[PDB]
Amino acid sequence: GDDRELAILATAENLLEDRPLADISVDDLAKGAGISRPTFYFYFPSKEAVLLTLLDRVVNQADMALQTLAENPADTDRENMWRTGINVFFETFGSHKAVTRAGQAARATSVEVAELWSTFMQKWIAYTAAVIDAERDRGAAPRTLPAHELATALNLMNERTLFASFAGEQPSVPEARVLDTLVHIWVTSIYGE
Amino acid sequence: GDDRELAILATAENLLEDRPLADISVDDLAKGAGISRPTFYFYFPSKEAVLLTLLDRVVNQADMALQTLAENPADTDRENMWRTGINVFFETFGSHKAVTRAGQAARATSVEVAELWSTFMQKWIAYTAAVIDAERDRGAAPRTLPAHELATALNLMNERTLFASFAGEQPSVPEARVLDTLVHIWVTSIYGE
Ligand SMILES: N#Cc1ccc(N2CCC(CCC(=O)NCc3ccc(N4CCCCC4)cc3)CC2)cc1
Numbered sequence: 014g015d016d017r018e019l020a021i022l023a024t025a026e027n028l029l030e031d032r033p034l035a036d037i038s039v040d041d042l043a044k045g046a047g048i049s050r051p052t053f054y055f056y057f058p059s060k061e062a063v064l065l066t067l068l069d070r071v072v073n074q075a076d077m078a079l080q081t082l083a084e085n086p087a088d089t090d091r092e093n094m095w096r097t098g099i100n101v102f103f104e105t106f107g108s109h110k111a112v113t114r115a116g117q118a119a120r121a122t123s124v125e126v127a128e129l130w131s132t133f134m135q136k137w138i139a140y141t142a143a144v145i146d147a148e149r150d151r152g153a154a155p156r157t158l159p160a161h162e163l164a165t166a167l168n169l170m171n172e173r174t175l176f177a178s179f180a181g182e183q184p185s186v187p188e189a190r191v192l193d194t195l196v197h198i199w200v201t202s203i204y205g206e
Numbered sequence: 207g208d209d210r211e212l213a214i215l216a217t218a219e220n221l222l223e224d225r226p227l228a229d230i231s232v233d234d235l236a237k238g239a240g241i242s243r244p245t246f247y248f249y250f251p252s253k254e255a256v257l258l259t260l261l262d263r264v265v266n267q268a269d270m271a272l273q274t275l276a277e278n279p280a281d282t283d284r285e286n287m288w289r290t291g292i293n294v295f296f297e298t299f300g301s302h303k304a305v306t307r308a309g310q311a312a313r314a315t316s317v318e319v320a321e322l323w324s325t326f327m328q329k330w331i332a333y334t335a336a337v338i339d340a341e342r343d344r345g346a347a348p349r350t351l352p353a354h355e356l357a358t359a360l361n362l363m364n365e366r367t368l369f370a371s372f373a374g375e376q377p378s379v380p381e382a383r384v385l386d387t388l389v390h391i392w393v394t395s396i397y398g399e
């Protein structure tokens with residue numbers, strides 16, 4: 014039941030490795046899921062709601078992993094705490110690159126994709142700013158920019174850089190170098206005076 | 207002659223303040239330019255080639271201003287040299303926000319918009335990396351990350367942050383704060399050890 018639903022999601026994610034949402038039909042999704050076209054429409058109002066759900070699941074998987082990290086701190090130096098947190102996004106979205114690239118293209122046309130994006134970007138920026146403020150209160154980082162504006166620009170940087178890398182856009186940081194590159198920019202901008 | 211062409215460009219830019227490319231018709235563009243629809247097609251193969259040209263002009267205006275800056279250095283402290291260079295992008299794209307937002311949405315669907323983007327992003331990253339390498343050779347900045355990977359991530363950050371600000375996306379750095387925010391991240395990541 015939820016079984017046919019998972020099959021429809023697994024098929025869309027496999028086909029999105031191969032072509033854009035525009036070149037995938039509902040019949041392709043039903044064919045791969047082993048169901049009819051009207052049975053598809055029982056589970057999803059459209060192929061776009063299928064993308065929306067896949068993106069929702071990827072975003073919630075990152076959010077949950079971050080929640081886990083936050084509750085039980087990886088005890089390590091400061092550099093490593095930031096590395097570990099950015100790696101959540103690198104590994105989560107990096108394990109679903111076709112969803113990430115399709116979700117990105119859809120932010121342009123879909124009001125629901127734009128809102129899901131915006132809700133989670135705000136949540137992760139607020140968390141990031143809470144960590145920078147924690148570090149400033151303990152005296153580990155200087156009071157330079159407003160924490161919240163710093164956290165917005167660093168999160169936007171990661172979103173754009175991670176996503177260019179995963180799509181291999183011209184130009185982009187190679188995926189094997191993108192984590193070191195981001196952590197250097199984060200640690201220097203947060204701790205630097 | 208080039209006169210009717212400018213009129214068609216000026217009309218598209220005015221209408222793009224109001225609605226997306228999808229909600230602008232060739233007849234709207236011809237109506238605003240004071241010409242017929244077939245006379246439009248003489249100058250532009252499509253409304254999309256009109257957007258492509260407007261974006262091309264905005265990108266070339268930024269590039270030329272940067273070329274001017276590069277030939278005659280604004281003599282000032284290091285922080286100010288970076289501020290002045292990023293301000294080229296803030297002022298240029300910031301003076302054509304509807305073109306910038308429409309061009310951005312089109313990168314998703316248009317192969318020619320994607321290539322224009324990619325050509326100039328590479329050129330400005332290469333220039334940025336040349337400046338970081340100049341600073342390292344003179345001993346003013348430490349050899350930390352590869353200059354070119356650092357320059358890719360900082361340019362991607364600016365592209366994403368400037369464009370979110372100009373569109374007032376939720377979330378974004380307020381436009382009155384975005385220049386200070388970026389220059390802090392640049393100067394700390396470039397000079398910080
Ligand atoms: N639709 C959609 C959608 C919504 C949001 C998206 N993204 C927004 C933000 C992007 C980058 C954010 C990002 O890279 N966040 C960095 C971050 C998060 C948490 C932490 N810590 C350190 C201490 C312990 C853990 C907490 C440190 C750094 C990743 C992609 C992307 C897509």
Ligand SMILES: N#Cc1ccc(N2CCC(CCC(=O)NCc3ccc(N4CCCCC4)cc3)CC2)cc1
Pocket residue numbers: 261265272275276287288290291292295309319322323324326327330333334337361362364365
């Ligand atoms: N289509 C298209 C398209 C193509 C490229 C686009 N962008 C790409 C890069 C974005 C940000 C780049 C950006 O902000 N560049 C920063 C930069 C450039 C030059 C310098 N200097 C300092 C010393 C003297 C002058 C030279 C310093 C910083 C701005 C938007 C945007 C759209």
